[PDB]
Amino acid sequence: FRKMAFPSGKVEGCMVQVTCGTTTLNGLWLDDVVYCPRHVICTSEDMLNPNYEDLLIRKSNHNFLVQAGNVQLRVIGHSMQNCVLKLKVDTANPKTPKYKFVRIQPGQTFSVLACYNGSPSGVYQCAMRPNFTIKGSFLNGSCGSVGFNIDYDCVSFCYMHHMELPTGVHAGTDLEGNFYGPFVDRQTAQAAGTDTTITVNVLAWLYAAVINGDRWFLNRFTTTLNDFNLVAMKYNYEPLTQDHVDILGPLSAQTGIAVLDMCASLKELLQNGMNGRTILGSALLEDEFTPFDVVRQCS
Amino acid sequence: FRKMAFPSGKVEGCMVQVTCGTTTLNGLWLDDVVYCPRHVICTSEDMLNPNYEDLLIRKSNHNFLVQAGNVQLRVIGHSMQNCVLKLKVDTANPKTPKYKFVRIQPGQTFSVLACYNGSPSGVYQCAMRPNFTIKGSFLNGSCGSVGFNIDYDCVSFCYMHHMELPTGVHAGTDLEGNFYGPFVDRQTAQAAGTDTTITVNVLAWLYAAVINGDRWFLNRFTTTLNDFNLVAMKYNYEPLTQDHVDILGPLSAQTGIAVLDMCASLKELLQNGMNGRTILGSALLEDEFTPFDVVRQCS
Ligand SMILES: *[C@@H](O)[C@H](C[C@@H]1CCNC1=O)NC(=O)[C@H](CC(C)C)NC(=O)O[C@H]1CC[C@H](c2ccccc2)CC1
Numbered sequence A, B: 001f002r003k004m005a006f007p008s009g010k011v012e013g014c015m016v017q018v019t020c021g022t023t024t025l026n027g028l029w030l031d032d033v034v035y036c037p038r039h040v041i042c043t044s045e046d047m048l049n050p051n052y053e054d055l056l057i058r059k060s061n062h063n064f065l066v067q068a069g070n071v072q073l074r075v076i077g078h079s080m081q082n083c084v085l086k087l088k089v090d091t092a093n094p095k096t097p098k099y100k101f102v103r104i105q106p107g108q109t110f111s112v113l114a115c116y117n118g119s120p121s122g123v124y125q126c127a128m129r130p131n132f133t134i135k136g137s138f139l140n141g142s143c144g145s146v147g148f149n150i151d152y153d154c155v156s157f158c159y160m161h162h163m164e165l166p167t168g169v170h171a172g173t174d175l176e177g178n179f180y181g182p183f184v185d186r187q188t189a190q191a192a193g194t195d196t197t198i199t200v201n202v203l204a205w206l207y208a209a210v211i212n213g214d215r216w217f218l219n220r221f222t223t224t225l226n227d228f229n230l231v232a233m234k235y236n237y238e239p240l241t242q243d244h245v246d247i248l249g250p251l252s253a254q255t256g257i258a259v260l261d262m263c264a265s266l267k268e269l270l271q272n273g274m275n276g277r278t279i280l281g282s283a284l285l286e287d288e289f290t291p292f293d294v295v296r297q298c299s
């Protein structure tokens, strides 16, 4: 059982390089539109407190250099939508997959195709935390890298990368340019607030553990939803709801472990730690697998 | 800092479905040749102790159904090379990337594109352990999935998946069909022997930690190569050599921490555990990042 990303090929064919002045980042080329973070129009002496409206007025289509491999694209229109720029180009991307834009919910997962200068470097799996940050791997130049899921042949884009926070975590927008969380695109320290653990995902991962022969943490006890949450609260775990319980149903059915029984084992793990033992090769409780992820991987 | 796979697009375009009888697995379609594990010619009542030579003699080209998406490929020749079958087909794959076959060394890493019925399901990063197993995520039907690295535009294929061991780990071949390790393709329990930790990789990962602001484990001590290895041995860590030291050089240079100083901190971690603290979000010492991987990710 491994942290698995979706195959990235459909998205690799959408990444391009966007330069304005001396600032270069990545853009997403779908049909005849390139999407990129608006701070590509910023100089280093603009990022502290940019007035994007005023900065963009000084820019014309020909100030946007868009490059797909060795080929230049002609920019024939531009506009700002929230924190993203949309550059209309004269050529539809012939590699455009079936796609949609979605605004993902906290606790859900997606794959990130980290890019630099418009070239894919690597792919990994992330979760949108309850505080609307993600714990990625991003260097200077990675802005415009996107996060996505794939449903059959359809790519659902959900994230575009914009900035780093002092805690080392990452923040960004949906593909309409609205940040996840309370963040703004300026180079100041910003607070994400307390993060909380995604309880339903930890449970899913404990089920995956049991499915993979690791069972030492199961005990003889059960609990109540109300009583588990009294312990969840203390640990900054998200409260569990009956919808969570029914979401966990197929895993409970495959393992034969009632959900409230697994909750009892989780309380004991939370109160007593792991006494140096491990679970699927981790010494911490893992919360970036959804129930859906676990089902998909164990079938 | 994250466990990152290479973009999988170049390899996605090489995966096909291979069926012989009622047994179906994945094959790798490069130029006019499809490569797949030879046990595709086995029935369930053959896998306990197959005589592959005898089994294959009963098979003709038309018994191999090769499917790429919705299109059948015509098989015009077949032969067995070690534990792989090579099916000559009448059509060169138009998506064949620049590629080579390499037999990878223990301690090195590569990406796995896990496939089922010839369709990519997910991508993740693995290491070839010192005992020539890998710790993957593979279900029935995943055989023929490949592992690879990418160097610029060139795909180096290094692994094809064949079987699972009782410990839950995985074993397979290079693309010439020679197993990594002492394994054979028959459905019996087989031993991998003691695994050992990849010391040079743990050091690389501690450097990555320091590069990412996590420094609590650094101490005031140093050691000697000879004296560190006395402690390595006891913990079933691989001995460190001066070549390892020079490999770690660029990381030592970027952080300003002498390699033997980092070795001192590692000895203390090994002797004293982590007392509930963490390093890059893990409560265990991580050994599936090479120095090269760390450099690539932190630049
Ligand atoms: C892409 O342009 C880039 C991605 C960043 C670079 C470093 N890692 C990333 O993920 N984004 C930015 O540079 C971003 C531009 C804004 C939106 C105009 N600026 C940014 O993220 O600035 C951060 C720098 C570090 C700073 C900080 C860190 C630690 C302690 C205190 C303060 C937070 C803001």
Ligand SMILES: *[C@@H](O)[C@H](C[C@@H]1CCNC1=O)NC(=O)[C@H](CC(C)C)NC(=O)O[C@H]1CC[C@H](c2ccccc2)CC1
Binding pocket: B025, B039, B042, B047, B138, B139, B140, B141, B142, B143, B161, B162, B163, B164, B165, B166, B167, B170, B184, B185, B186, B187, B188, B189, B190
């Ligand atoms: C692909 O065909 C498949 C991949 C396996 C399926 C399950 N997970 C995997 O990675 N390989 C095989 O089925 C393989 C065929 C051989 C090469 C002819 N057989 C195989 O791996 O058999 C294992 C089954 C389980 C068994 C065992 C497990 C636990 C305890 C004792 C014994 C080890 C061999």
